[PDB]
Motif scaffolding. Structure first.
Motif, PDB file in Angstrom:
ATOM      1  N   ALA A 140       2.300  17.241  10.564  1.00  0.00           N
ATOM      2  CA  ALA A 140       1.611  17.301   9.288  1.00  0.00           C
ATOM      3  C   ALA A 140       1.011  15.952   8.902  1.00  0.00           C
ATOM      4  O   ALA A 140       1.659  14.912   9.018  1.00  0.00           O
ATOM      5  CB  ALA A 140       2.552  17.794   8.201  1.00  0.00           C
ATOM      6  N   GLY A 141      -0.231  15.983   8.430  1.00  0.00           N
ATOM      7  CA  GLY A 141      -0.906  14.766   8.017  1.00  0.00           C
ATOM      8  C   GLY A 141      -1.096  13.777   9.150  1.00  0.00           C
ATOM      9  O   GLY A 141      -0.157  13.472   9.886  1.00  0.00           O
ATOM     10  N   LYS A 142      -2.316  13.266   9.280  1.00  0.00           N
ATOM     11  CA  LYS A 142      -2.642  12.294  10.318  1.00  0.00           C
ATOM     12  C   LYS A 142      -2.338  10.870   9.849  1.00  0.00           C
ATOM     13  O   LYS A 142      -3.177   9.976   9.965  1.00  0.00           O
ATOM     14  CB  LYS A 142      -4.118  12.417  10.708  1.00  0.00           C
ATOM     15  CG  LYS A 142      -4.448  13.710  11.437  1.00  0.00           C
ATOM     16  CD  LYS A 142      -5.950  13.910  11.567  1.00  0.00           C
ATOM     17  CE  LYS A 142      -6.590  14.180  10.218  1.00  0.00           C
ATOM     18  NZ  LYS A 142      -6.009  15.382   9.558  1.00  0.00           N
ATOM     19  N   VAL A 143      -1.137  10.670   9.316  1.00  0.00           N
ATOM     20  CA  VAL A 143      -0.722   9.360   8.827  1.00  0.00           C
ATOM     21  C   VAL A 143      -0.201   8.473   9.958  1.00  0.00           C
ATOM     22  O   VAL A 143      -0.422   7.261   9.959  1.00  0.00           O
ATOM     23  CB  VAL A 143       0.369   9.492   7.747  1.00  0.00           C
ATOM     24  CG1 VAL A 143       0.737   8.129   7.180  1.00  0.00           C
ATOM     25  CG2 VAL A 143      -0.089  10.432   6.641  1.00  0.00           C
ATOM     26  N   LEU A 144       0.500   9.079  10.913  1.00  0.00           N
ATOM     27  CA  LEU A 144       1.063   8.342  12.044  1.00  0.00           C
ATOM     28  C   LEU A 144       0.027   7.428  12.706  1.00  0.00           C
ATOM     29  O   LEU A 144       0.313   6.262  12.978  1.00  0.00           O
ATOM     30  CB  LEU A 144       1.641   9.312  13.078  1.00  0.00           C
ATOM     31  CG  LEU A 144       2.245   8.651  14.318  1.00  0.00           C
ATOM     32  CD1 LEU A 144       3.386   7.727  13.927  1.00  0.00           C
ATOM     33  CD2 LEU A 144       2.721   9.707  15.303  1.00  0.00           C
ATOM     34  N   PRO A 145      -1.190   7.937  12.980  1.00  0.00           N
ATOM     35  CA  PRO A 145      -2.252   7.151  13.612  1.00  0.00           C
ATOM     36  C   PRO A 145      -2.373   5.742  13.033  1.00  0.00           C
ATOM     37  O   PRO A 145      -2.720   4.799  13.743  1.00  0.00           O
ATOM     38  CB  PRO A 145      -3.507   7.964  13.309  1.00  0.00           C
ATOM     39  CG  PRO A 145      -3.030   9.373  13.254  1.00  0.00           C
ATOM     40  CD  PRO A 145      -1.629   9.320  12.699  1.00  0.00           C
ATOM     41  N   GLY A 185       0.806  -1.205   0.000  1.00  0.00           N
ATOM     42  CA  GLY A 185       0.000   0.000   0.000  1.00  0.00           C
ATOM     43  C   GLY A 185       0.843   1.260   0.000  1.00  0.00           C
ATOM     44  O   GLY A 185       1.763   1.398   0.804  1.00  0.00           O
ATOM     45  N   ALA A 186       0.523   2.184  -0.900  1.00  0.00           N
ATOM     46  CA  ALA A 186       1.257   3.442  -0.998  1.00  0.00           C
ATOM     47  C   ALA A 186       0.343   4.625  -0.706  1.00  0.00           C
ATOM     48  O   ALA A 186      -0.769   4.707  -1.225  1.00  0.00           O
ATOM     49  CB  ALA A 186       1.885   3.582  -2.375  1.00  0.00           C
ATOM     50  N   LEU A 187       0.817   5.542   0.131  1.00  0.00           N
ATOM     51  CA  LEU A 187       0.035   6.718   0.495  1.00  0.00           C
ATOM     52  C   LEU A 187       0.760   8.003   0.108  1.00  0.00           C
ATOM     53  O   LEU A 187       1.971   8.123   0.279  1.00  0.00           O
ATOM     54  CB  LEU A 187      -0.262   6.721   1.994  1.00  0.00           C
ATOM     55  CG  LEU A 187      -1.077   5.529   2.497  1.00  0.00           C
ATOM     56  CD1 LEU A 187      -1.300   5.629   3.998  1.00  0.00           C
ATOM     57  CD2 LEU A 187      -2.408   5.447   1.763  1.00  0.00           C
ATOM     58  N   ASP A 188       0.001   8.960  -0.413  1.00  0.00           N
ATOM     59  CA  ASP A 188       0.551  10.243  -0.827  1.00  0.00           C
ATOM     60  C   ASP A 188      -0.493  11.338  -0.673  1.00  0.00           C
ATOM     61  O   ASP A 188      -1.689  11.083  -0.785  1.00  0.00           O
ATOM     62  CB  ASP A 188       1.035  10.184  -2.276  1.00  0.00           C
ATOM     63  CG  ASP A 188      -0.056   9.770  -3.238  1.00  0.00           C
ATOM     64  OD1 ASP A 188      -0.524   8.619  -3.138  1.00  0.00           O
ATOM     65  OD2 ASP A 188      -0.441  10.595  -4.093  1.00  0.00           O
ATOM     66  N   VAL A 189      -0.036  12.556  -0.404  1.00  0.00           N
ATOM     67  CA  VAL A 189      -0.942  13.681  -0.226  1.00  0.00           C
ATOM     68  C   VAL A 189      -0.290  14.991  -0.657  1.00  0.00           C
ATOM     69  O   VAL A 189       0.796  15.337  -0.193  1.00  0.00           O
ATOM     70  CB  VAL A 189      -1.387  13.801   1.245  1.00  0.00           C
ATOM     71  CG1 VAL A 189      -0.184  14.019   2.152  1.00  0.00           C
ATOM     72  CG2 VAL A 189      -2.404  14.922   1.412  1.00  0.00           C
TER      73      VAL A 189
END
Length: 98
Positions: free
Chosen positions: A71-76, A4-8
């Motif tokens: 920045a960005g709530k990715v850590l959660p 899975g790849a995430l980008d914003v």
């Protein structure tokens, strides 16, 4: 060999699923920014059901002992993956000389 790849950029989040290394870009869909728990819900639904069992995400990260997840709530999500024994790794700088 699916990951899975995430980008914003600044509103829309890109979704990609394939082999770690990819020349073109590889994708799958996209999700609009949401809350902390919400993003997890959306991510799990895909990561969990899609059977990815691995997520990769690039982020500058401010880095600091006290407080983080700048920045960005990715850590959660990263915490969920790590806890559930899910493979994960933050992608450093995209461009870089060998």
């Amino acid at each position: 060999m699916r990951v899975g790849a995430l980008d914003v950029g600044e509103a829309r989040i890109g979704l990609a699923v394939g082999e770690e290394g990819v020349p073109l870009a590889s994708g799958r869909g996209y999700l609009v920014r949401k809350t902390l728990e919400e993003d997890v819900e959306a991510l799990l639904d895909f990561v969990r059901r899609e059977g990815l069992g691995k997520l990769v995400v690039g982020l500058p990260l401010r880095t600091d002992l006290k407080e983080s997840a700048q920045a960005g709530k990715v850590l959660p999500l990263v915490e969920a993956l790590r806890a559930r024994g899910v493979e994960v790794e933050l992608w450093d700088e995209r461009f870089t000389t060998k």
